[PDB]
């Protein structure tokens, strides 16, 4: 249960959660309603799990691309801002938080990656990706390096993958086509090949994550990084005179970041929906409320018109918007999760040498476009729901290592949860092949396996 009479808020650890709590303490002062701001790890994954059982926070913050999956699962309340309030934010930020005709979150700020560069190490930052290897050789001779950014999250490597023509889902006739994915076309391959060549030539290292990259740039050890507005604050505290500018071009085309709109959603199980609306609309989405958060960690280009007029004067914000206008606003469709997981696997495997570029993106393509619900439906109705409780717990014990099933998970997870985890580890037809292989030599399920063999040909 969620505690009535107060507000719990989840926001990512890289945003200004202390400034957000200052706005919460003003809310407590004015109303008597305690606001608790928390930043748990993997919150975009933790929320769907806890919210699917009526738990979790009253308000969740994340970029808009996750919210369509949350809304489709019924985890959010439809927000209804009055006409007068909607006029206070830019029309396109409302578009980012609209799903199935319903507004499903409050838009807060627009984020786009930019190139951040140390002006003392590099007064003329490169215009092209192609010239960076030469810059790195010259900089390594001084004991520095040219560029370090997070290679563990595909968000940061996407601008280069999209540059020569890679894309997520085709936008066709007013809607996203979930079957037309562009992650293994010629442009996506060319971009990822360049990234792997940057690593193979020891200009970057496959192990670099967010913490390593940020520490490297803020200690003056690398000349450039790739990050968004939240990261400016820590560079201000460090002794690095930095600039924020346009991402380098690749093969003469601009880098195309996926643009995210930081948004706040209201848990459908929250008993404090009216309080949540009051806090977001009249304490956060004000010049005073946004200023408290922005001073902690820069939000980017805020959705609130009156306050963005002041922030648009900042050159770092003009750079953020210039990069954004070369990319696109992320889709919010529920398939975006499967897209991000698939691209993450491709970038990591290619960057490490596990798979060739062509192998990694081919797998990411088919995984992103796969008919996940179709196979889950077969796995559940024609597989798990046709075996008894004794055989179900036996199968879960066989799957323990593969699905990361603790002892408690093996006792409590039901067939729907196991079906979801299984198809995510064994994508598409492979999850039917894994159950057939697992239930092969169980004489009681010979009939079950018999149909799964036919229903996997029937679906094909
Ligand atoms: O890399 C996958 C990841 O990309 C985006 O996440 C961004 C987020 O929008 C930024 O605000 C910041 O926190 O960096 C994140 C990447 O680490 C998507 O929003 C997210 O759904 C996706 O998993």
Residue numbers in the entry: 1 to 460
List sentences from the manuscript.
MBP is one of the most commonly used protein expression tags due to its exceptional performance in enhancing the solubility of the target proteins.
Nonetheless, the target protein structures from all three different crystals are essentially identical with an rmsd of 0.30–0.40 Å, demonstrating again that the MBP fusion strategy enhances the crystallizability without alteration of the structural features of the target proteins.
